[PDB]
Amino acid sequence: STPNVLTNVAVSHSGEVDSLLIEKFNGKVREQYLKGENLLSHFQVETVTGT
Amino acid sequence: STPNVLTNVAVSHSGEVDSLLIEKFNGKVREQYLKGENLLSHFQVETVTGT
Known part of the structure; x- marks a missing residue:
């Protein structure tokens, strides 16, 4: 009727x-x-190297 | 004058x-x-065979 041993x-x-x-x-x-967000683009950002 | 018994x-x-x-x-x-509804269409079925 049924296999029962698979x-x-x-x-x-x-x-x-x-x-x-x-x-x-x-x-x-x-x-x-x-x-x-890339929010710093609005402001002026100068680079300081000597001081 | 009438069909009395039909x-x-x-x-x-x-x-x-x-x-x-x-x-x-x-x-x-x-x-x-x-x-x-066929609501499953939004999702990828990702068929599985073997594993």
């Missing part, structure tokens, strides 16, 4: 590891969304 | 039934509508 391949015979699957990676990495 | 095939002299008509079907059936 030839499952994802189960390790020894039992050391939970699963034999490899956990594929989709190729996406995320950082924050912060963006530069 | 012959009628829709009446049962013996009784036990109101009428003798056939109750035709006309071939129409109704079911629920359930418009498909």
Whole structure:
């Protein structure tokens, strides 16, 4: 009626590891969304080197 | 001067039934509508095989 003995391949015979699957990676990495305001452009900014 | 006793095939002299008509079907059936939202289209399905 029912098989009841499945030839499952994802189960390790020894039992050391939970699963034999490899956990594929989709190729996406995320950082924050912060963006530069660029606010110093308005002001006059001189460079001081000697003093 | 009048047809007093009309012959009628829709009446049962013996009784036990109101009428003798056939109750035709006309071939129409109704079911629920359930418009498909298709809301999953916004997201990438990212099919998985093997792992």
